[PDB]
Amino acid sequence: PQVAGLKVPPHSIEAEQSVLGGLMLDNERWDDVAERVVADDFYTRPHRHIFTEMARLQESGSPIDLITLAESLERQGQLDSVGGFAYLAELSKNTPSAANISAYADIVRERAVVREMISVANEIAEAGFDPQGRTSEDLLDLAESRVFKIAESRANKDEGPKNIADVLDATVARIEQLFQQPHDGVTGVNTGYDDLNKKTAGLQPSDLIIVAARPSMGKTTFAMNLVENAAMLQDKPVLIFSLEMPSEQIMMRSLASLSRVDQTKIRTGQLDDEDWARISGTMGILLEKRNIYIDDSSGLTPTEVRSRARRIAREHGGIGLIMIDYLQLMRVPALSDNRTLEIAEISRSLKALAKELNVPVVALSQLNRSLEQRADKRPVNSDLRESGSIEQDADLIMFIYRDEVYHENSDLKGIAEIIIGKQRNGPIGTVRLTFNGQWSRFDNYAGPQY
Amino acid sequence: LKVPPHSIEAEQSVLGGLMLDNERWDDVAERVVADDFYTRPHRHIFTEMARLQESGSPIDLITLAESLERQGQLDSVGGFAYLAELSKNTPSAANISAYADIVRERAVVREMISVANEIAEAGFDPQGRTSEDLLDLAESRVFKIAESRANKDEGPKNIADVLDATVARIEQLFQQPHDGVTGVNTGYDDLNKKTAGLQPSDLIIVAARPSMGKTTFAMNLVENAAMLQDKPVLIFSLEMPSEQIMMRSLASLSRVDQTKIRTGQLDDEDWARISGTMGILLEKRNIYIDDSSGLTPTEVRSRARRIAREHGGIGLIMIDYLQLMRVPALSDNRTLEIAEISRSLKALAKELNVPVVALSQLNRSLEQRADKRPVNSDLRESGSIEQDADLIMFIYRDEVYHENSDLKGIAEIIIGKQRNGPIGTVRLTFNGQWSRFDNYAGPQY
Amino acid sequence: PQVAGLKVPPHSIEAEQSVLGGLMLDNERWDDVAERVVADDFYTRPHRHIFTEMARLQESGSPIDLITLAESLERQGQLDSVGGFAYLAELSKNTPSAANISAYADIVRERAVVREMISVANEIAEAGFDPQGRTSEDLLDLAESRVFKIAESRANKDEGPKNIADVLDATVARIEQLFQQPHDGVTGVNTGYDDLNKKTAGLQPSDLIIVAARPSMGKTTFAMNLVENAAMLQDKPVLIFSLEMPSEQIMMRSLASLSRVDQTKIRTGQLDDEDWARISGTMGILLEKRNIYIDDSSGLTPTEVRSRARRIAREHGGIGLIMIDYLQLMRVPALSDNRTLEIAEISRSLKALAKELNVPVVALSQLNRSLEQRADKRPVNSDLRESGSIEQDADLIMFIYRDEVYHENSDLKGIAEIIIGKQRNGPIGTVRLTFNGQWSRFDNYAGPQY
Amino acid sequence: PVVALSQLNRSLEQRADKRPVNSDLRESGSIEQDADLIMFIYRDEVYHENSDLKGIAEIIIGKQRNGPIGTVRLTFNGQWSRFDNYAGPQY
Ligand SMILES: Nc1ncnc2c1ncn2[C@@H]1O[C@H](COP(=O)(O)OP(=O)(O)O)[C@@H](O)[C@H]1O
Ligand SMILES: Nc1ncnc2c1ncn2[C@@H]1O[C@H](COP(=O)(O)OP(=O)(O)O)[C@@H](O)[C@H]1O
Ligand SMILES: Nc1ncnc2c1ncn2[C@@H]1O[C@H](COP(=O)(O)OP(=O)(O)O)[C@@H](O)[C@H]1O
Ligand SMILES: [Mg+2]
Ligand SMILES: [Mg+2]
Ligand SMILES: [Mg+2]
């Protein structure tokens, strides 16, 4: 009957059956499950054992679907204790589609934690009635312990609140490591532009830089210049998620910058021996390193972006930089109707990413026309209208004003000034850069002052 | 075999030995309170006799009976015969302290089992609550007994039991110098007077358009309250990691600009301040920091409980750029998200007897006003925090929105809400390269 | 075999042991169980009589566990007669969690109905075949009364529908008891504001008052003044649920208001002898009385509010006032997905409480900030957006406006007006009061008409 | 072989194209897993009038265990309930 079954401890075996075989079908969602779920949150011995195997093996063994699991279990030699491969095959039979997993990873936690807490309550009571030579303070410190042990068994790392001295020693090691080598003016990533390295103090390793201007001001060119220089200097990856334009134009413009010959003398082939030599030079010095990876997709969400980036992270080493062109595309199905909160959540998640990996971010944007009808037309932070979320999240913003698009009579055609709208860890101001942009590159401007 | 453990002749013994010796009253009262006992009549006896020991000394048999008649309560305690049974029996000696002690012990136990059973109830019939919103309940209810010393975790409170704590509060400060302060000192001799210190149950909110160093101000607060006070503090930087936080606070102390530190070059003049503040900070270990990515309020509560379980009790908190906080279940709608956040914050602070400091942000419908001082109706996040809070401090600083304006190197603290006091406005300075506001010793505003 | 297991009347015995095992192990639940179960709902006579004692004691003698029960059970001569002490120990030995009771008392009621219906069906049929020379008129009224006796066995004796004449006797007795004594215009509770009792006839005793405003008008002060006054104007308790802020501030405020001194002379300590005199007076008047009870809780539900209140009601006297502060914090978690239904639930439940005890209920609120864009700002029934159920349940609503926040050039300084906006018994109006908040109290205003 | 007809949730409706797929079949995968062949169906005379597919029926196949997937065209003359083959432009 049910009355004899009512004393049962809550357990949801059905989803617990589904989840294992669902991950046997796919090892791509495995991290989001490993975080949210732990062994003891499985009810019985065998499922728990199988998840133990499937969790330890991905530290070393990539292939865990059906049979390398048998190789593992052989190296443990615990055949026919969970039924071995017999009941394992009975399990691997199940959920041959396994579309999604999240709720089936959450209800486990619900039932597991509830069961555990209630066992604890039972213990507290029946201990209070059978005290066994004990007194209140000792009677109750155990209660503190058994209550706070639960979530402590689920926390994973020292992610918790850092004592002061640890972060202190970390920062002091940074100061010392920097004190060894020359100052360089930089405390992070270099951009090449020495005049910019001062104000910015170098692109810092934990931030969400933003760059912005109307379309034909060529912000995209500047972003590619940044990643370009940062790739040639470092011994470390970079990444580029260009959305609007596919990659076979990206690389043409990249060679236009690196190689200082226009697109037209490349797509055609009118290039002289010196020009052939410089194209071959950029080719050969990129070939040795091969830092860049590119995803020239159509439209994306931050959730996919974290996966695509962390895959590169685990492939080799910590990354050095990221770029994102024309931010406004990156969707979110939840708020596909509204836009304000959409941009808010985008910026939020990208900040979270950049902190999750301790690496910078570039992330461009568009502006609103209305600065046209101000008659000075110089950008300010009020101009880009996205509810001003980015004006809060961002550790850095800067703008571009190429003089020649609006005015032509003026003599400063071909010069472009950067405006730094806001910076967290420094001052604001401006700089002056120059533009020989039939091959899409900026360079320094060693003129008189501004 | 099993029973909610009560002793019942110890109780009668205490009542009897308390009747004949009216003076034997503080030795008891320091150990026992009405709800500590088991039955109803003995409680009402105890509290009426307390009412009599207000002034009336003689309380054994007859004056008690007469008062208890005046409240019209005789014979609901048995009767006058059952009463005189007590003075008849138990002429015992002064083995009275340990009686009250064991009775208090039994009461603590009974309370413990009651809590455990409530936990089991809410484990079986959660009423849509998940586990996250359930461990919160459990840990709170247990912690309230474990930390607390008055061991009456839940219930209403009759008044005398409240006035005792109130007047102990009003007592302890007069002995020390009061100095206008109650709670925490910010170190700013003008703000202390408009505030009397960050009172230890209140949700403070800071609010400003970004480039104002509100982050800097809050760091300055927790810093000064880390050194003056001798209890922990917490700093949650959802805005940025701790390697920047450390440089900034250390800079604020040593009065050396950041651009010199991270550059890695500096003078003996500066080393003599760095080493010092390092050591003075290190021989306390006040601080704890968390450089997380995205937090719920429940995680905040959890971490805080574990801290105070370690040792003593915290005294200040700082949360950073509150809009990042997201309770995931209601991520689809934003207003209720903010409301639940602020609710949880308030209950946290009230639970631990602390202040809280929570930064925020503002809507840009103020810039077109052409005056640009903030006020209450400027922040549009449903106004869910305007109703929850106790203290607010907007910030304005003229040398952003103008270059030539003749208030250079000055900010100001526009207060817009005060739960226990009045409002005002204050003048402070800003030297943004070593990141510390200072007092404005000058004319008024 | 099992076939002969079908003619048995349905019953449960393990649940019947487990219930009593929990109740004997814990007294906190008797409300719920007695709100689901009655003596005859059990199977046999012993467990019936046991439940009889375990209710009839908690009527007056609260404690019922194992031996405080047996000490009464003996005096009716029933030891070693309903199972006895040795067997009765079994019930307290096993199931020492008291983990679930309510479920283990639902099914008993189910089977009890299912059995007391069938025992009636058979007893109707056999008489329908053994008519005894009866006639239908003498044969169907018994069946009526039989079927209805089932539901009568459960119903509490004093919740049914009353006749006109008894109610009318109560009414005339009320008017009589009034005319034995002056009237003062009051029909219940007094406040201290004679300007208010005329439009209100006092706080009536079975209602849901609401006191709504913008943040800084001072509603909290007003409610505290009300309960503060009704303390000394009565010989009967009160309650407060200061969900907003804890006791050590509330009592400072209350004390101060009673003694006409500012808070800033207490917590500072720069005060006079006249001061301490007026302090000790109100102190020694509060403590010779023992009316008030306070609850510095954090977050609550009506389900717990009812329990905390009824504990007070059953301990001593019947309460005569309540206050609840900053209502919005009251969680009822099942609905927290939504808010409109949440407020509807709370209002519904508080109304039901107040009427279940025949007492008033102050309860505060907040107003949405829509009025600001109107330039009149005198609040009205339309600007509170909390499902508008509070606009329906309430037998009274009294907003608060106070010009010297919005304007500062005021011809209307130190004056707070009370915009009543709804009434269920009297008429509407508007009251004019004065404010001097450095000690947080409102006062009368002997002044011009309006 | 065994034919076994079935029905579809209206969950497909709001998609603005309303051609079925496998995931449109909300049946806890109870036959998306325990099947060998599927052939969803569509007929554009239903959802839209200005669709230039008057008298068209297409056999959408979200799955075939033993072979390749596809997408196929037929006609429809429901006035006596029969399908024919399509001899027109390709697909
Ligand atoms: N053949 C060319 N002649 C002149 N300018 C060029 C040529 N090719 C590229 N550019 C410059 O490169 C810039 C890149 O701009 P664009 O890619 O449109 O910016 P965004 O990516 O923001 O749209 C252009 O604004 C343009 O002035
Ligand atoms: N080293 C520095 N040199 C010059 N200005 C600085 C320096 N550090 C900070 N600032 C200024 O101080 C302000 C601090 O703002 P911040 O602390 O980020 O508060 P918020 O997070 O609200 O912007 C910035 O506007 C910045 O311009
Ligand atoms: N100690 C004080 N001195 C001067 N004014 C005060 C003091 N305490 C409170 N006030 C004023 O009186 C008001 C009290 O109302 P309050 O309790 O804040 O109502 P609410 O809970 O609705 O905010 C405050 O808003 C404040 O303006
Ligand atoms: Mg572009
Ligand atoms: Mg900040
Ligand atoms: Mg209030």
Of B121, B148, B171, which residue sits at a domain end? B171
Is there a domain that residue C254 lies in?
yes
Q: Are B287 and B235 in contact (CB under 8 A)?
A: yes
User: Nearest to residue A441, comparing CAs of A306, A234, A259, A298?
Assistant: A259
Q: Are residues A295 and A422 in the same domain?
A: yes
D24 CB within 8 Å of a chain A CB:
no
A186 CB within 8 Å of a chain B CB:
no
Centre of ligand 1 from the C-alpha of residue A229, in Å? 19
User: Nearest to residue C184, comparing CAs of C196, C168, C201?
Assistant: C201
Residues C54-66 as b or e (16 or more Cβ within 10 Å = b)? bbebbeeeebbbb
The shares of helix, strand and coil residues in chain C, as percent rounded to the nearest 5, are: 50, 5, 45
* CA end-to-end distance (rounded Å), chain B: 75
Q: How far is CA C133 from CA C142, C146, C302, in A?
A: 15, 20, 58
- Separation of alpha carbons B171 and B290, rounded Å: 37
| Continuous segment of H or E residues that includes residue B67 | helix B62-70
Is there a domain that residue A168 lies in?
no
Is there a domain that residue C159 lies in?
no
Q: Where are the alpha helices (DSSP H) in A99-218?
A: 102-129, 136-152, 164-180, 194-199
B270 CB within 8 Å of a chain C CB:
no
The number of the ligand 3 atom at minimal distance from the alpha carbon of C221 is 17
The pairing of beta strand B203-207 with beta strand B356-360: parallel
Is there a domain that residue A160 lies in?
no
Q: How far is CA A443 from CA A277, A414, C2, C389, in A?
A: 21, 12, 95, 67
B403 CB within 8 Å of a chain C CB:
no
Give chain B's length: 445
User: With the C-alpha atoms ordered A330, A333, A336, A340, is the resulting torsion angle positive or negative?
Assistant: negative
- Separation of alpha carbons A180 and C160, rounded Å: 90
Helix and strand numbers, DSSP H then E, in chain C:
15, 8
User: Residue A263, exposed/middle/buried by CB under 10 A (0-12, 13-18, 19+)?
Assistant: middle
Q: Are residues C122 and C233 in the same domain?
A: no
- Separation of alpha carbons A206 and A269, rounded Å: 42
Structure tokens at A349: 């998640």
Resolution in A: 3.9
User: What is the domain count for chain B?
Assistant: 2
CA angle A31, A34, A35 (to 5 degrees): 90
Mutate to test the pocket of ligand 3, among C404, C408, C436, C440 (most ligand atoms within 8 A of CB): C440
The pairing of beta strand B287-290 with beta strand B356-360: unpaired
> Residues of A numbered 196-235 whose beta carbons fall under 8 angstroms of chain B's beta carbons: which are they?
201, 206-207
Mutate to test the pocket of ligand 2, among B399, B435, B436 (most ligand atoms within 8 A of CB): B435
- Separation of alpha carbons C315 and C295, rounded Å: 17
Is there a domain that residue A27 lies in?
yes
Q: How far is D33 from chain A (nearest CA, A)?
A: 6
Using only C-alpha atoms, chain C has a radius of gyration, in whole angstroms, of 29
| Chains within contact range of chain D (3+ C-beta pairs < 8 Å) | A
Q: How many CB atoms lie within 10 A of CB C370?
A: 11
Q: How far is D77 from chain A (nearest CA, A)?
A: 37
Q: Are residues B375 and B417 in the same domain?
A: yes
- Separation of alpha carbons A29 and C90, rounded Å: 52
Residues linked to residue A209 through DSSP beta bridges, in sequence order: A396
Q: Are residues B273 and B194 in the same domain?
A: yes
The pairing of beta strand C396-398 with beta strand C240-241: unpaired
- Separation of alpha carbons C446 and C431, rounded Å: 11
Residue whose entry in the numeric block shows the structure tokens 């409480």: C353
Q: Where are the alpha helices (DSSP H) in B283-334?
A: 297-310
What DSSP line would sit under A218-244, residue for residue?
Answer: -HHHHHHHHHHHHHHHSSS-EEEB--S
Residue type, A164: I
DSSP B317: E
Q: Are B320 and B359 in contact (CB under 8 A)?
A: yes
Residues B68-105 as b or e (16 or more Cβ within 10 Å = b)? beeeeeeeebeeeeebeebbeebeeeeebeebbeebbb
Q: Are residues C388 and C240 in the same domain?
A: yes
CA neighbours within 13 Å on the CB side: how many for B419?
20
| Chains within contact range of chain A (3+ C-beta pairs < 8 Å) | B, C, D
The pairing of beta strand C415-418 with beta strand C431-436: antiparallel
- Separation of alpha carbons B137 and C301, rounded Å: 13
Structure tokens at B280: 């003075």
Structure tokens at B210: 């970004």
Mutate to test the interface with D, among A97, A100, A337 (most CBs of D within 10 A): A97
Residue whose entry in the numeric block shows the structure tokens 């099992």: C2
Q: Does A140 contact B146 at a Cβ distance shorter than 8 Å?
A: yes
Residues A33-47 as b or e (16 or more Cβ within 10 Å = b)? bbeebbeebbbeebb
Q: Which residues, 6+ apart, have CB-to-CB distance to D35 below 8 Å?
A: D63, D65
User: How was this model experimentally determined?
Assistant: cryo-EM
Q: Is C203 left (phi over 0), alpha (psi -120 to 50) or beta?
A: beta
User: Nearest to residue B375, comparing CAs of B190, B207, B215?
Assistant: B207
Nearest CA to ligand 3 atom 7: B421
Whether D and B touch (3+ CB pairs < 8 Å), yes or no? no
DSSP C66: S
Give chain C's length: 450
Q: Does A3 contact C104 at a Cβ distance shorter than 8 Å?
A: yes
User: Nearest to residue A293, comparing CAs of A247, A234, A252, A254?
Assistant: A247
Mutate to test the pocket of ligand 1, among A438, A439, A442 (most ligand atoms within 8 A of CB): A438
Centre of ligand 4 from the C-alpha of residue A243, in Å? 9
Q: How far is A310 from chain D (nearest CA, A)?
A: 28
Q: How many CB atoms lie within 10 A of CB D52?
A: 7
Q: Are residues C234 and C285 in the same domain?
A: yes
D29 CB within 8 Å of a chain A CB:
yes
C52 CB within 8 Å of a chain B CB:
no
Q: Are residues B302 and B350 in the same domain?
A: yes
Q: Which residues, 6+ apart, have CB-to-CB distance to A370 below 8 Å?
A: A383, A385
Write out the E strands in chain D: 37-42, 57-64, 70-74
Residues linked to residue B396 through DSSP beta bridges, in sequence order: B412
Q: Which residues, 6+ apart, have CB-to-CB distance to A211 below 8 Å?
A: A219, A222, A223, A362, A363, A364, A365, A397, A398, A399, A400
- Separation of alpha carbons A352 and C415, rounded Å: 51
φ, ψ at C142 (rounded to 5°):
-65, -35
- Separation of alpha carbons D91 and D76, rounded Å: 17
Q: How far is CA A120 from CA A142, A251, A437, C91, in A?
A: 11, 62, 71, 22
DSSP B2: -
- Separation of alpha carbons C95 and D82, rounded Å: 70
Q: How far is B119 from chain A (nearest CA, A)?
A: 7
Cα C362 from chain centroid?
12
Q: Are residues A250 and A380 in the same domain?
A: yes
Of C120, C154, C188, which residue sits at a domain end? C154
Q: Where are the alpha helices (DSSP H) in C78-179?
A: 84-93, 103-129, 137-154, 164-179
Q: Are B98 and B13 in contact (CB under 8 A)?
A: no
Q: How many CB atoms lie within 10 A of CB B4?
A: 22
Q: Which residues, 6+ apart, have CB-to-CB distance to C263 below 8 Å?
A: B420, C252, C253, C256, C438, C439, C440
Is there a domain that residue A194 lies in?
yes
Q: Are residues B235 and B378 in the same domain?
A: yes
User: Residue C235, exposed/middle/buried by CB under 10 A (0-12, 13-18, 19+)?
Assistant: exposed
Pocket-forming residues, ligand 3, beta carbon under 6 Å = B 418-422; C 215-221, 263-264, 437-438, 440
Q: Are residues C276 and C408 in the same domain?
A: yes
Of B113, B136, B171, which residue sits at a domain end? B171
CA neighbours within 13 Å on the CB side: how many for A133?
0
| Continuous segment of H or E residues that includes residue B235 | strand B233-236
Give chain D's length: 91
Residues linked to residue A417 through DSSP beta bridges, in sequence order: A401, A432
Full residue range of the structural domain in which residue C87 is found: 3-154
User: Nearest to residue B212, comparing CAs of A397, A392, A204, A398?
Assistant: A392
The pairing of beta strand B233-236 with beta strand B317-319: parallel
- Separation of alpha carbons C98 and C19, rounded Å: 8
User: Nearest to residue B119, comparing CAs of B144, B104, B138?
Assistant: B138
Is there a domain that residue C450 lies in?
no
3-state SS assignment for residue C241? strand
Q: How far is CA A11 from CA A4, A114, A444, B19, in A?
A: 16, 10, 67, 58
Q: How many CB atoms lie within 10 A of CB C118?
A: 12
Q: Are residues B377 and B400 in the same domain?
A: yes
Encode C295-329 in three state secondary structure: ECCCCCCHHHHHHHHHHHHHHCCCCCCCCECCHHH
User: Nearest to residue C286, comparing CAs of C250, C316, C243, C245?
Assistant: C250
DSSP D10: G
Q: Does A95 contact D32 at a Cβ distance shorter than 8 Å?
A: no
B239: CATH: 3.40.50.300
Q: How many CB atoms lie within 10 A of CB B347?
A: 21
- Separation of alpha carbons A189 and D71, rounded Å: 53
- Separation of alpha carbons A92 and A23, rounded Å: 10
Q: Are B360 and B384 in contact (CB under 8 A)?
A: no
CA neighbours within 13 Å on the CB side: how many for B31?
19
Q: How far is C103 from chain A (nearest CA, A)?
A: 8
- Separation of alpha carbons B361 and A344, rounded Å: 13
Q: How far is CA B268 from CA B256, B265, B271, B272, B273, in A?
A: 12, 10, 5, 6, 9
- Separation of alpha carbons B247 and C59, rounded Å: 67
Centre of ligand 1 from the C-alpha of residue A216, in Å? 6
The number of the ligand 3 atom at minimal distance from the alpha carbon of B419 is 18
- Separation of alpha carbons A131 and B113, rounded Å: 12
User: Nearest to residue A114, comparing CAs of C41, B311, B128, C63?
Assistant: B128
Residue type, A294: I
What DSSP line would sit under B333-391, residue for residue?
Answer: -SHHHHHHHHHHHHHHHHHHT--EEEEE---TTSGGGSS----GGG--STTTTTTT-SE
Q: Does C96 contact B383 at a Cβ distance shorter than 8 Å?
A: no
Q: Are C420 and C428 in contact (CB under 8 A)?
A: yes
Structure tokens at A392: 């809060």
Q: Is A132 left (phi over 0), alpha (psi -120 to 50) or beta?
A: left
DSSP C48: H
Pocket-forming residues, ligand 1, beta carbon under 6 Å = A 215-216, 218-221, 437-438, 440
Centre of ligand 1 from the C-alpha of residue A263, in Å? 11
Q: How far is CA B436 from CA B194, B221, B241, B246, C80, in A?
A: 20, 10, 20, 14, 81
What DSSP line would sit under B163-229, residue for residue?
Answer: HHHHHHHHHHHHHS--TT-SS---S-TTHHHHHSS--TT-EEEEE--STT-HHHHHHHHHHHHHHSS
Cα C372 from chain centroid?
36
Q: Does A122 contact C96 at a Cβ distance shorter than 8 Å?
A: yes
Residues linked to residue A241 through DSSP beta bridges, in sequence order: A324
Centre of ligand 6 from the C-alpha of residue C341, in Å? 24
- Separation of alpha carbons A347 and B421, rounded Å: 38
Is there a domain that residue A171 lies in?
no
Q: Are residues B156 and B267 in the same domain?
A: no
- Separation of alpha carbons A413 and A402, rounded Å: 8
CA B110, B116, B122, B125: dihedral to nearest 10 degrees?
A: -90
3-state SS assignment for residue C415? strand
Q: Which residues, 6+ apart, have CB-to-CB distance to A244 below 8 Å?
A: A325, A326, A329
- Separation of alpha carbons B432 and C225, rounded Å: 48
Q: Are C346 and C330 in contact (CB under 8 A)?
A: yes
Structure tokens at A200: 């910015």
Contacts of C251 in chain B (CB under 8 A): 159, 162-163, 166
- Separation of alpha carbons A290 and C365, rounded Å: 64
3-state SS assignment for residue A138? helix
User: Nearest to residue A420, comparing CAs of A211, A186, A191, A193?
Assistant: A211
Nearest CA to ligand 3 atom 3: C438
- Separation of alpha carbons B162 and A217, rounded Å: 69
B338 CB within 8 Å of a chain A CB:
no
Most distant CA atoms of chain C, gap in Å:
98
Structure tokens at C191: 């406040």
Centre of ligand 4 from the C-alpha of residue A296, in Å? 13
Is B237 touching ligand 2 by the criterion CB < 6 Å? no
Contacts of C107 in chain A (CB under 8 A): 2-3
- Separation of alpha carbons C178 and C185, rounded Å: 11
A89: CATH: 1.10.860.10
